[PDB]
Amino acid sequence: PKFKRLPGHIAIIPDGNRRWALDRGLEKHEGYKHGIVPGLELYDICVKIGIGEVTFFGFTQDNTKRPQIQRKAFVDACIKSVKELSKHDAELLVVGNTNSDMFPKELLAYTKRTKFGKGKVRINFLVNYGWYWDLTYAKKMIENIASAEIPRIDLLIRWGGRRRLSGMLPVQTVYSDIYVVDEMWPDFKPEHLFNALEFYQDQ
Amino acid sequence: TPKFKRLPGHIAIIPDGNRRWALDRGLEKHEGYKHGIVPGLELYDICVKIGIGEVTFFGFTQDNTKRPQIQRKAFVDACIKSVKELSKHDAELLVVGNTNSDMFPKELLAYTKRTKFGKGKVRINFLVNYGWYWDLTYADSKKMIENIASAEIPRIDLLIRWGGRRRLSGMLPVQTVYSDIYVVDEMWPDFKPEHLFNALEFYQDQ
Ligand SMILES: CC(C)=CCC/C(C)=C/CC/C(C)=C/CSP(=O)(O)OP(=O)(O)O
Ligand SMILES: CC(C)=CCC/C(C)=C/CC/C(C)=C/CSP(=O)(O)OP(=O)(O)O
Ligand SMILES: C=C(C)CCSP(=O)(O)OP(=O)(O)O
Ligand SMILES: C=C(C)CCSP(=O)(O)OP(=O)(O)O
Numbered sequence: 276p277k278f279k280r281l282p283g284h285i286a287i288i289p290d291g292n293r294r295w296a297l298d299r300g301l302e303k304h305e306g307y308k309h310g311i312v313p314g315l316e317l318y319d320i321c322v323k324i325g326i327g328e329v330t331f332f333g334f335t336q337d338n339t340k341r342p343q344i345q346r347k348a349f350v351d352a353c354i355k356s357v358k359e360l361s362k363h364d365a366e367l368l369v370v371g372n373t374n375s376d377m378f379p380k381e382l383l384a385y386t387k388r389t390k391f392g393k394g395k396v397r398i399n400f401l402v403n404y405g406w407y408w409d410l411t412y413a414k415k416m417i418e419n420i421a422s423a424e425i426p427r428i429d430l431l432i433r434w435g436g437r438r439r440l441s442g443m444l445p446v447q448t449v450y451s452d453i454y455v456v457d458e459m460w461p462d463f464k465p466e467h468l469f470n471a472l473e474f475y476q477d478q
Numbered sequence: 479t480p481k482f483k484r485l486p487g488h489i490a491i492i493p494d495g496n497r498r499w500a501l502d503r504g505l506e507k508h509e510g511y512k513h514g515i516v517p518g519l520e521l522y523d524i525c526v527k528i529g530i531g532e533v534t535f536f537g538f539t540q541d542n543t544k545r546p547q548i549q550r551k552a553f554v555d556a557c558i559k560s561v562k563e564l565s566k567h568d569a570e571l572l573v574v575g576n577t578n579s580d581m582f583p584k585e586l587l588a589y590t591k592r593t594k595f596g597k598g599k600v601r602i603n604f605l606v607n608y609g610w611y612w613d614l615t616y617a618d619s620k621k622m623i624e625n626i627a628s629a630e631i632p633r634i635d636l637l638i639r640w641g642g643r644r645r646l647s648g649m650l651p652v653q654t655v656y657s658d659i660y661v662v663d664e665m666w667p668d669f670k671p672e673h674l675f676n677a678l679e680f681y682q683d684q
């Protein structure tokens with residue numbers, strides 16, 4: 276589909292993976308592996324329509340306090356997503372608290388933005404991320420927040436039906452238009468993104 | 479008033495859509511703000527009746543002060559009248575904003591220290607000549623966040639925005655990190671009790 280106006284930078288909150296799994300009769304931790312292909316599909320659509328920058332919420336510092344079986348699954352799914360995007364022309368950046376045992380060592384290779392292939396889209400991941408860590412990391416202070424290499428967000432899209440930011444990038448979300456999909460993240464469809472983009476061009 | 483299982487401790491209000499409301503009625507854009515005063519007082523009356531302990535209103539931003547003088551004078555006048563009218567109720571009032579600016583109305587400097595009027599049944603905060611960057615930069619790394627300009631305003635449970643835009647417009651980025659966000663399509667001067675009741679049903683059903 277054709278759009279009159281496109282956001283320069285979209286933020287994604289891929290919430291609802293545990294509810295999705297429980298609804299399918301799987302264990303709570305089994306939804307995250309079903310969240311990988313939706314991200315790659317979203318990326319593909321963004322390359323096709325020409326979105327310049329996408330930031331995914333991977334996991335928060337609070338999420339690390341979840342049951343180990345869940346953490347290992349969502350961490351493994353974040354690593355696989357990043358690794359897979361590095362094979363398909365993403366310019367990748369991971370932002371999160373690397374001074375923590377909970378930062379996945381496999382993503383230390385991505386903490387300075389790295390072009391893969393043609394670098395068709397800037398893809399950012401928040402991993403072991405907290406708003407408070409971000410702001411206090413730090414007028415040099417605001418330009419020096421931990422997420423300073425992630426620019427202002429135009430459109431934030433959240434799956435899972437919760438209408439909240441969960442502390443995603445408070446500086447970059449000040450003026451973001453927010454679109455909520457009721458379906459859980461693993462039920463992602465191209466129409467969810469097209470509906471958010473219709474909403475955005477109407478603002 | 480329904481038998482809520484739970485209420486928000488703190489609601490934030492974004493009373494957007496006043497210029498659109500005015501234009502729809504054939505008025506000049508600046509004339510909508512005076513029609514946003516009584517809706518504020520109605521929202522206060524409902525909050526006191528149902529037991530909401532704390533409300534924060536978005537009064538106007540530093541960016542809003544770049545609008546035409548006739549608009550600025552009207553929304554400043556409407557914010558002054560709102561605060562004064564609320565001072566006749568059982569409200570503990572606090573204004574937060576950049577007072578080191580000729581755009582801060584001198585009439586509201588008195589309310590920069592939280593002040594209990596009558597029985598002080600609800601705490602009401604108002605953001606006047608507010609900007610998120612001014613707030614955060616106002617600020618040990620811990621002391622910094624506890625020392626933001628808006629530090630006397632706690633975490634927001636529920637944010638309700640009129641005028642159909644789904645965005646924060648830089649309202650209190652620290653306090654809104656986890657806020658549930660409810661958007662009413664009607665402009666602020668078309669405030670109805672059911673808008674607040676619908677937002678509260680939404681909040682408790684989360
Ligand atoms: C696309 C991408 C960034 C990576 C692929 C793997 C995924 C989807 C990671 C997200 C991890 C978490 C903790 C998301 C919240 S869903 P939840 O655990 O809060 O579930 P619930 O809301 O309880 O249903
Ligand atoms: C705080 C309170 C309860 C009442 C005091 C009077 C009012 C309603 C003041 C709010 C002032 C502003 C600038 C609101 C934005 S509506 P806008 O100018 O952006 O209108 P538009 O979105 O363009 O329709
Ligand atoms: C990694 C993310 C998708 C962000 C957190 S989604 P999470 O379920 O942790 O957030 P809340 O519903 O606000 O409790
Ligand atoms: C209600 C307020 C005082 C906050 C601003 S609503 P305003 O129209 O200024 O904000 P945007 O829609 O983001 O342009």
Ligand SMILES: [Mg+2]
Pocket residue numbers: 290291435
């Ligand atoms: Mg969740």
Ligand SMILES: [Mg+2]
Pocket residue numbers: 494495
């Ligand atoms: Mg407006």
